[PDB]
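Worked example (supplementary).
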Amino acid sequence: MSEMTPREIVSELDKHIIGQDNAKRSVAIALRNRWRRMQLNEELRHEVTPKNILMIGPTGVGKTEIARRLAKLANAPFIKVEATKFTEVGYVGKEVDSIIRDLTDAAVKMVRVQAIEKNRYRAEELAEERILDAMKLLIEEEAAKLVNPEELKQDAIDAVEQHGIVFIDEIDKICKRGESSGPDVSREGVQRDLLPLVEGCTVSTKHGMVKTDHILFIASGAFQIAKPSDLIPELQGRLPIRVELQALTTSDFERILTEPNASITVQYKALMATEGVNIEFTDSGIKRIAEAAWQVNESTENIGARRLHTVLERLMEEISYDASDLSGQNITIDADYVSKHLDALVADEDLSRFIL
Amino acid sequence: MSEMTPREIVSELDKHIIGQDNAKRSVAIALRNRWRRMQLNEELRHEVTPKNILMIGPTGVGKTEIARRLAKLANAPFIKVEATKFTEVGYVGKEVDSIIRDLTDAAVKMVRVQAIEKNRYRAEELAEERILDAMKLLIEEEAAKLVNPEELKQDAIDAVEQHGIVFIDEIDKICKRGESSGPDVSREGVQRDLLPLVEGCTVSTKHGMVKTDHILFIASGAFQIAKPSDLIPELQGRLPIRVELQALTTSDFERILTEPNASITVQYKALMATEGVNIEFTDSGIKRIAEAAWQVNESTENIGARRLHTVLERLMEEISYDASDLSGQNITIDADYVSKHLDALVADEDLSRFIL
Amino acid sequence: TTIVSVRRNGHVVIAGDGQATLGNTVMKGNVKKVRRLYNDKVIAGFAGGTADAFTLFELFERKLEMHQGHLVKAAVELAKDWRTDRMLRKLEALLAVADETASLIITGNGDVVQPENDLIAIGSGGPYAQAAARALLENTELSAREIAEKALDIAGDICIYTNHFHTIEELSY
Amino acid sequence: TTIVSVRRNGHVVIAGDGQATLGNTVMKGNVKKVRRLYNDKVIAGFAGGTADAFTLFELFERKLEMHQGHLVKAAVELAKDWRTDRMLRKLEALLAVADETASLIITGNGDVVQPENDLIAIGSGGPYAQAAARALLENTELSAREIAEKALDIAGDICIYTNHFHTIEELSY
Ligand SMILES: Nc1ncnc2c1ncn2[C@H]1C[C@H](O)[C@@H](COP(=O)(O)OP(=O)(O)O)O1
Ligand SMILES: Nc1ncnc2c1ncn2[C@H]1C[C@H](O)[C@@H](COP(=O)(O)OP(=O)(O)O)O1
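After joint prediction of all chains, the assembly is encoded as:
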């Protein structure tokens, strides 16, 4: 069983996210209390409601990343939702309860993908046992006789019920302030179509009756023009935890580039590997890069760490096309290279608005 | 009918809600008459209609909590509906009757969870007789062994028929004379779309045709803008009981903090136990707490007793992260501590609008 | 028309005239231009159209329910409804409301004015009233009631658009 | 009324009178006609209705941190919200803001003018204030706060719509 205390949850999260420790800890407590509570009286086990977190911060910092990886970590079900959809100021429909009728699919279609290696080995030493096609098809076919009724559901739902995780996104977008984008409370309705979920209810779905009484909920939004206090009050109440994440520094970019145990630069590496080329990324390279990102962000529209991605892939454009060639060679990307493909571009700003 | 006299219904309700004795008495009659009425003639059977209460009060007091525990205690089915949803000012659709076409599910997914025990033991002393992997399945495989036709079927609506409670929320705001929010009467349609429910009717749903001629109904709202007299007239008549709940005091939060028999603080207590730490709050620790909540309410947006929840978890953040460590220790929370982690916050008009 | 309000010692009052002048003649010369709300204090006068009022008035006594007491944190989301909003827009009214915490004003633009001494004086007799009022409120004793009523009387005497039928709500704290 | 600002040395300040005027008389003559979007820096002023003037005050307030301190990068996607956009037009005010970068002026219509030397002078007595402002900010070694405060006084002194209750913020950049 996963588990692991708050201290081990921040650890694990650092293998992926840079900075934003306040968030990792805060999301590491809400989490822990589950395992905590799960072990209590029949009473409290039905009284200590989950412990939701409301994240407040600029775009491109981790809000969404923390919880996506906090899911993988928990191995539990995850699902990200744009609160905005359920506002559809068009005049359509979007039964919020749906939010659950997925974190079931994703929590079920998962089970069938979590068990294709739960009895992989086993079903094969039999996919050769009934032969002494022989593994070609007969494996799946045998993977059809692998005791699958009842157990599925019970667990599936009880996987959601257990502790699926629903990360609402850009909630701030559904509050009402005063001037500008101040249409009408119809929006504040989407706020009211959620209470059920975030307050205890049952929803009927294909696989069975799921209850969001014990689901953890992580809402976000920058809250640029609206304080979390402008959210309907019932939500303010079901949102016990509040973390304000900070704006990432150039120093953070330099980090987000190389540190995380599955880094971006480290992906390019392996990627250009399959092409016999070997890349080295100088520190000053990794730096001028960051500066690149930071620059396009200050200069034009501020997207965040997200920026790394474009500007970066825009640097191996050359490398990857050729890559097939270069096999048996080790390309070296250092500062006066990063700048041989960046400066003149990150400087036009307008182009910066199209390809950067 | 589980029984219990008005006096006895208020007793239970006080183990959970502090104050508001008026409502507790109130919903204690509407409930009683059920027991009563069902003891008369086949005649008055379809003549003595339910006894609906309309709760008028500020936000946070206890309306919804009262009816939630009042249900739990009635062991009857319960469901909370945001009246405005069905107003769906987004031009969609939503059969009001869906309100019932749910309070059946709740009272269904229930009849099946309220029997996982009703015959747990018995069905397990069978998992023996049949034996003396797949040892924990034959438990479930008893799901059929155990009788479910008819009873755990038709006797199910008699639940969502006997005395299941439908608690409408913010009935107000669905009224017309509001000015601040005085659009039209399509809103008032929602008022006229409910009449069937609260005037007697039958709706068609999966497990069977149920009738709301005997459902008890509890609607709320603040009536800040509109009055109960501004509700369509039919409704005014099918709403015999009117009760005004009072605004909770500083003296009330101190209580809501410890008194009720599942208390907040008492939850942290048990909770932070799992981590070997023993906590304990001082009357004055618990006082400043209250004073804090009351403070944030006055200072920014007055949400109510709900504020305890955030202010509380916000002041146990440190402890709960560390908790894993501290084991075998007994952290004590007095006022010189509550202040130490809250006067700062509470003091800042704006931060309080974010993380408190 | 002259709405007055002086705060002195334990209380604060609002006085007003009853002269309603259409053209160059005085119709209902006894209009109760000053009203309370009594839900619990918060005396407010009114200056101008009597139709184009009330609305921008009782609208107050409702937020003074939710926001309860916070006259201040009332005019915010309240008064607002008068400029960049809807309901009533483009009229003529100077609702001079008084809590127990401070006497504000609204130039009829979702506005708010805090008189240098909590002394309010708006009306086709506003200045006049002020002057007398101010002159007493600092060279004699006499209370908020008195000084206000003695000043409204001086106003009515100079302003031909103001008379002497009075109306005054008082309180204590 | 006269809002003044005089970027000088390592600082920039904005001063203002406090005279509110009903026709030919003066009400709240102590009007806090200058405040700063405390968001670190960004001092602004206001010339006209006290009511609305506030809207374009918090309006900025938010766009700032999202457009994070990048003042200029604001009026584009901010100020504009007056002309076109639907927020609110047909009003009258001039929030003369100022980061630690430059001092602008919006004639109300999502506009923006910048003084040949950053010397901002608006308000009734707006010109007068500048004539003194320029005259000193050119023949003396006086301060940004001084030349302003000294100027707002000459203004008030010669303009009958501007008094001497001042109000001024500052900083250091
Ligand atoms: N602090 C951080 N450390 C590492 N990667 C980060 C990061 N902040 C953002 N990223 C990366 C991971 C994401 O794929 C991408 C965008 O971040 P995100 O979490 O999806 O956005 P946000 O949470 O701001 O909505 O950038
Ligand atoms: N008087 C009281 N005694 C005990 N708990 C209370 C209380 N008032 C509120 N609470 C708690 C229980 C609820 O989970 C939470 C919110 O209360 P609620 O009943 O949902 O609000 P309301 O019905 O006013 O909309 O606060």
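Two points are worth noting when inspecting this output. Strands of chain B lie at 53-56, 78-82, 165-169, 202-205, 208-211, 216-219, 241-244. The domain at 2-109+157-245 of chain B is CATH 3.40.50.300 (Rossmann fold).
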